[PDB]
């Protein structure tokens, strides 16, 4: 069930990247239309997958970054990012 | 050798991403130091991997991009990119 994953395979979860840039809610809807979800930041913070999900949308609306958020993130809604669906 | 592949698995070859930006010669040296090579652009041109290998180094020296370069009349080729080793 791993070669059937045309993306990033981790433990049984397949992450498909979408090169097109969408907003957070749009990305949420896009993943939902494929029966998937935005990657959880916790599940990838300490893995090798982080280098692929950098500056990509997370489930919490805030993007996925190496360091924890720099404590002054005001508005994430008005911007587009790439995303993965899993 | 697929769950031991911490990267992109295609055709039997594992592509390891290096998020740090090196020149072409440096990326070649790192891939050689990992007993790997820079990805062949042809083996991934018509696959699903382009979305990961966008703007990354190829084995021929030219980077891997979806559309063909129109002008490239700059002749310093002094650029830093991400790269994969396989």
């Amino acid at each position: 069930h791993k070669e059937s994953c045309n993306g990033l395979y981790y433990q049984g979860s397949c992450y498909i990247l979408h090169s097109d840039y969408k907003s957070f809610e749009d990305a949420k809807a896009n993943c939902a239309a494929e029966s998937s979800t935005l990657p959880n930041k916790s599940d990838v913070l300490t893995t090798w997958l982080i280098d692929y999900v950098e500056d990509t949308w997370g489930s919490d609306g805030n993007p996925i970054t190496k360091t924890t958020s720099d404590y002054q993130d005001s508005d994430v809604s008005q911007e587009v990012r790439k995303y993965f669906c899993t | 050798h697929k769950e031991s592949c911490n990267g992109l698995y295609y055709q039997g070859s594992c592509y390891i991403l290096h998020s740090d930006y090196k020149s072409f010669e440096d990326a070649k040296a790192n891939c050689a130091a990992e007993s790997s090579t820079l990805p062949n652009k042809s083996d991934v041109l018509t696959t699903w991997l382009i979305d990961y290998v966008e703007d990354t180094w190829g084995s021929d020296g030219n980077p891997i991009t979806k559309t063909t370069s129109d002008y490239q009349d700059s002749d310093v080729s002094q650029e830093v990119r991400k790269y994969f080793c396989t």
Partner: protein
Amino acid sequence: QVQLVQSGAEVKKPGASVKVSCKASGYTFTGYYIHWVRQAPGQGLEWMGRINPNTGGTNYAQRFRGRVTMTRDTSISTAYMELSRLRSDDTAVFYCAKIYCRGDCYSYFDYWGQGTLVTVSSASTKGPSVFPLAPTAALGCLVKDYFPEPVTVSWNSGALTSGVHTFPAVLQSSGLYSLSSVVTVPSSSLGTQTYICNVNHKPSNTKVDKKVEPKSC
């Protein structure tokens, strides 16, 4: 008779410099200007410039002044049109012409020579992937993701010429060419005949013999 020739079909990557030659015969080389006309696939005939085989002087049109250089020699009796720093849209055919008037002048083009197709693309030489189009009933072969032109597609080692349609190549966003070769045959022949497409890509030296069998299931 008058003749003008050049080794054309020169696929070149952009940034490089293509040097088209033009050997002329049948008249006095030093008596007439040699003119160059380019035909882009989308655009029309566009005059580029002229050169005197007597003096070496060059007269270029705008959009080609300083990026194009014409030279010549009287010994080999040849005129050379050179384009440097090629770009994507310069893909065009470059004809050579001897003009009717003599000297510093302009007239109608007395004689023409064979064209010179120059494809300018960063895409590298790549063999095509051939996929069946299984089945009056029609069936075909899709050759995809190859470079450069041309691929020659025959059916059954050239044994089937009635009803064959080898469409002109199309350029995809990836820079790789695609082509579809189809053919219509009677339904009676579905069972007793195997259908072979022989696709040959000379620049990649790729020979594929693909069988388009009738659909199973």
